[PDB]
């Protein structure tokens, strides 16, 4: 009986649950069912938490963990010709208008950054990591520019004060 119960608790569910949580799930189900038979009313979560001497939020966590998944090959409609898996929207796909909007945003940002000088645009692109993935820090840009980091930081502050102008913001405001 030990081998049968342990092996059923291991290989019963499609998502594997350890045996102590399966034990408390079985205890919760038997407790709720017996209190329904002896009561005539299906009890409350606080009643079950009173009976099992645990907290009601733990009772809700257990009753959320106890739910087994559904299968994607069932008949959704009236007649059976439609699987469930044909009506699930793939949200991780490409929305295909925001991608081309991202491309146009990159080109617009290129135009706006190229309306300034060379040192400013280079420091900004190295600071925020546009030509490469990793953003260079102030010490890295001071190394690549032959200066200290304080001049780099003053250049950064002055350029960020420059870029908040409406002449450089009226085209980029609608991109957020």
């Amino acid at each position: 009986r030990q081998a049968i119960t342990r092996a059923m608790a291991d290989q019963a569910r499609t998502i594997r649950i350890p045996v102590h949580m399966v034990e408390v799930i079985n205890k919760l189900g038997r407790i709720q069912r017996e209190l329904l038979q002896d009561l005539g009313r299906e009890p409350t979560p606080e009643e079950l938490a009173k009976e099992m001497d645990i907290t009601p939020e733990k009772v809700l966590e257990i009753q959320q963990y106890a739910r087994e998944p559904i299968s994607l090959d069932q008949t959704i409609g009236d007649e059976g010709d439609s699987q469930l898996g044909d009506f699930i929207e793939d949200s991780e796909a490409v929305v295909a208008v925001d991608a081309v909007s991202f491309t146009l945003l990159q080109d617009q940002l290129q135009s706006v950054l190229d309306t300034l000088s060379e040192r400013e645009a280079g420091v900004v692109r190295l600071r925020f990591g546009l030509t490469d993935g990793q953003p260079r820090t102030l010490d890295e840009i001071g190394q690549v520019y032959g200066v200290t980091r304080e001049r780099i930081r003053q250049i950064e502050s002055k350029t960020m004060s420059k870029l908040r102008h409406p002449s450089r913001s009226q085209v980029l405001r609608d991109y957020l």
Partner: protein, 99 residues
């Protein structure tokens, strides 16, 4: 013949595949009847969804997060074991069972 499918084909040969072909297609041997960790919802190790066998779930990310961008691509994390690449190779890599 072709394997990257450049839409330049002239034949499509079917054939009865041997065990030497089966264990040549596969990337890793699945050896546990688990799918997903019940608590953190991550793919289990050596399961039917294992990220070492079938590839990573996140774009250019290993399992332990030690390599997390495109500059580490085409390498394998020496701790976790997931080859860091795009996450769309979970649609194309196969595994096998040794009976």
């Amino acid at each position: 013949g072709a394997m990257l499918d450049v839409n330049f084909f002239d034949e499509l040969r079917i054939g009865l595949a041997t065990a030497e072909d089966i264990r040549q297609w596969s990337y890793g041997e699945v050896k546990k009847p688990e799918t997903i960790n019940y608590r953190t919802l991550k793919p289990e190790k050596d399961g039917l969804f294992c990220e070492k066998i079938f590839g990573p779930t996140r774009d250019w990310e290993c399992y332990c997060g030690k390599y997390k961008r495109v500059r580490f691509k085409g390498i394998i994390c020496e701790r976790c074991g997931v080859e860091v690449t795009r996450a769309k190779v979970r649609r194309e890599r196969m595994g096998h069972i040794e009976l």
